[PDB]
Design a protein around this nucleic acid. Structure first.
Ligand SMILES: [Zn+2]
Lengths: 58, 81, 76, 389, 97
DNA sequence: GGGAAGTAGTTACGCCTGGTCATTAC
DNA sequence: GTAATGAACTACTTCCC
RNA sequence: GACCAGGCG
């Protein structure tokens, strides 16, 4: 399991779910996950729009 | 309405994954789960009320309980930034 | 006391002190790293309970600490 | 509850505290307030209903439908309470042996197996859930038999049973259930295999419990007992003592319902009617119990029913008791009719030759077993030349 | 108990019958052989017999063919209806020590 | 105020024999 | 492979309507 | 070393 450097999206595969580019850093520590962006106000605070897992300070 | 649930400090990261899997089984009305590694032994769960977190916390051995009282959002921006 | 089977036997005070030290270390790390009030204000209660049991294990209105075998521990 | 006019007046005095102040849900609100003080309003109702369901007389069931029967039983208990106040019933004696039952291996082992199986099922549930969540549904449904087989750990049962049997510390806080066998000689082992112990605490005096009782005749040895603080609290079975097992109760109930007894729901008890109890619970009323007890005991003597059934009656309260459970201590006796014992010389001869055995003597109705309940109605002669009408 | 209700979306297990086997011991290398009370006493073993249980898998509300698994071992009362010494003659007991 | 009612503290001295402990999920 | 915790007694003190 | 059970005066 990896995480995109720019998307901050924790990726379980070689290709990011939201971006066709395959980028990773293998230095993610924090884990942030959201089930429903439409309901989660934390996603509104961070500006996310796609459900899934995210990192913060990669 | 954020809530705090105490878990064993060995497998907090796996706990988040197993809640993320468990939320689908009964379609729990839960918005987001938080579990930074800087804070050990506790996780943050977004839910409308205490009944939802109580129903979503059963069946997990590592989940010990839920702390009383709502955790304000204001106390936690320093982590999600 | 060293058992003939190779395992070590330790007094109850050692176990209680180990628990106290672990709780204190976790509370210190949480305080240093920053946390919501509901976290430290619960670790504080846990540490107070551990110290209270360590000094006296038969205090009124508190569940006595229990060993791995189910026997209540002996303390000071 | 009842129909006695004095009981009616007492109940009219009692109702005014709640007759015109509460309804069915209001009492639920009160109970919820008490069991869950200062908690969520909706939480209180569920907590109170749960407590009512599975904490009030659980032996009547835990379904919400059994609440009417629970109310009937509670009313009967209250009727006994108020009947004590007016002096219509003498207080019960705790040391009378009709109120005590023994616990044998078959029930302690049952409890231990119950707790071990309760642990095992939860362990299996956890293992199956984790395996399915980790490997995925395709692996689980590829070979379901292997999936079920390889998810069982058969040690949590064996180790927990074995440790409890070895140390002697039973679940539930009891201690000293299992003891080491005394093998000094023949008598020590044989006497150790026939011990009876009391669960009371040793240090306290317990003046009433340590004394001998009249009902101990033929069931407990009056002279073999320890010498230290254990005196009285540890006793040994007599030689004539016979412990009883249990027969199914539904068959007994449906047999009892078939000879004139009306159900409790259909008809309310009144002072002119006898009461009938089965294993401590009330099941109905009859117009004449003196003939009913004779019929039941005559049927038992004939051989229609099992010999573990004992029937006794008290005419002071107009009650009839029937017992069919295990744990009672009984002794054998010779039936006497019309002032003539039913045992003859030819019976002794047949026993001596070998044609007749003890079980056949029991079956033919010559000898019957009596517990502490039936012995109330008996009048036993001591020597064969002292019998009369 | 009735059965097991795991969190699998379409799975449930129903319990069947229970059986008690012969008193036996399993060597650490794999084989299982009969056991006798004196052998258990000398070797500091436990005189017990295995237990068997039938599990009925239920998939989508339809019962499947049953399966049988061993859930553990149960100690055996000496000279009971299942002990190896039941009904033996005096010389048989003498030969067994 | 002087009646509950609910804590809180104790309960003889030696000696002998044997048996069990002193975690576990991955 | 290891890091992880899950019955009587008697005299005071506190109420209290 | 601590517990449990049983005995002796
Ligand atoms: Zn990406």
């Amino acid at each position: 399991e990896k995480a995109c450097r720019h998307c901050h999206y924790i990726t379980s595969e070689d290709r990011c779910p939201v971006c066709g580019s395959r980028d990773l850093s293998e230095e993610w520590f924090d884990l942030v996950i959201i089930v429903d962006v439409e309901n989660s106000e934390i996603a509104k605070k961070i500006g996310a729009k796609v459900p899934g897992k995210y990192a913060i300070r990669v | 309405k954020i809530f705090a649930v105490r878990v064993t400090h060995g497998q907090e990261e796996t706990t988040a994954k197993l809640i993320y899997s468990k939320v689908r089984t009964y379609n729990l009305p839960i918005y987001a789960i938080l579990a930074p590694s800087r804070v050990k032994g506790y996780i943050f769960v977004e839910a409308p009320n205490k009944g939802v977190v109580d129903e979503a916390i059963r069946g997990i051995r590592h989940a010990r309980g839920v702390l009383p009282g709502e955790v304000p959002f204001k106390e936690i921006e320093h982590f999600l930034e | 006391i060293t058992l003939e089977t190779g395992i070590r036997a330790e007094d109850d005070l050692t176990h209680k002190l180990v628990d106290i030290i672990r709780i204190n270390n976790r509370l210190k790390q949480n305080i240093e790293a920053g946390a919501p009030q509901l976290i430290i204000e619960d670790l504080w209660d846990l540490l107070q309970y551990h110290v209270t049991t360590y000094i006296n294990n038969e205090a009124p209105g508190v569940p006595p600490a229990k060993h791995k075998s189910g026997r209540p521990l002996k303390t000071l | 509850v009842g129909n006695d006019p004095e009981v009616q007046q007492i109940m009219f005095d009692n109702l005014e505290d709640a007759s015109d102040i509460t309804t069915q849900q209001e009492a639920l609100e009160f109970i919820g307030k008490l069991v869950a003080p200062g908690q969520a309003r909706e939480y209180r109702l569920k907590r109170a209903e749960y407590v009512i369901d599975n904490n009030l007389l659980p032996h009547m069931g835990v379904s919400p439908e059994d609440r009417i029967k629970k109310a009937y039983y509670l009313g009967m208990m209250a009727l006994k309470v108020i009947e004590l106040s007016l002096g219509r019933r003498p207080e019960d004696d705790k040391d009378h042996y009709a109120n005590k039952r023994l616990r044998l291996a078959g029930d302690l082992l049952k409890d231990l197996f119950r707790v071990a199986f309760s642990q095992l099922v939860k362990d299996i549930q956890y293992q199956m859930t984790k395996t399915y969540q980790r490997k995925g549904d395709k692996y689980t449904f590829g070979n379901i038999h292997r999936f079920i087989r390889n998810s069982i750990r058969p040690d949590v049962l064996t180790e927990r049973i074995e440790h409890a049997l070895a140390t002697g510390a039973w679940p539930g806080g009891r201690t000293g259930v299992s003891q080491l066998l005394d093998r000094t000689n023949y008598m020590s082992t044989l006497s150790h295999l026939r011990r009876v112990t009391s669960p009371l605490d040793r240090e306290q005096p317990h003046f009433e419990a340590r004394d001998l009782h009249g009902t101990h005749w033929g069931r407990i040895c009056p002279t073999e007992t320890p010498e230290g603080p254990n005196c009285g609290l540890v006793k040994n079975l007599a030689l004539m003592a016979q412990i009883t097992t249990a027969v199914p109760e539904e068959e007994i109930r449906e047999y009892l319902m078939s000879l004139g007894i009306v159900p409790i729901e259909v008809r309310r008890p009144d002072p002119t009617l006898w009461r009938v109890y089965l294993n401590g619970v009330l099941i109905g009323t009859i117009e004449d119990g003196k003939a009913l007890v004779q019929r039941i005991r005559q049927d038992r003597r004939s051989g229609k029913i099992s010999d573990v059934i004992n029937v006794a009656y008290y005419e002071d309260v107009k009650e009839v008791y029937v017992n069919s459970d295990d744990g009672r201590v009984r002794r054998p006796l010779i039936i006497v009719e019309n002032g003539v014992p039913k045992l003859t010389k030819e019976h002794v001869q047949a026993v001596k030759e070998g044609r007749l055995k003890w079980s056949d003597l029991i079956k033919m109705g010559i000898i019957e077993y009596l517990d502490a309940e039936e012995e109330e109605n008996a009048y036993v002669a001591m020597w064969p030349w002292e019998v009369t009408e | 108990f009735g059965g097991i209700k795991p969190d699998i979306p379409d799975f449930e297990v129903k319990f069947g019958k229970i059986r008690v086997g012969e008193p036996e011991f399993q060597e650490p290398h794999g084989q299982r052989k009969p056991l006798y009370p004196m052998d258990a006493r000398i070797r500091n073993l436990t005189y017990a017999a295995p237990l068997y249980l039938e599990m009925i898998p239920v998939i989508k509300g339809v019962e499947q063919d049953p399966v049988e698994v061993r859930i553990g071992e149960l100690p055996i009362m000496l000279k009971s209806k299942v002990c190896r010494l039941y009904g033996l003659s005096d010389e048989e007991l003498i030969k067994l020590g």
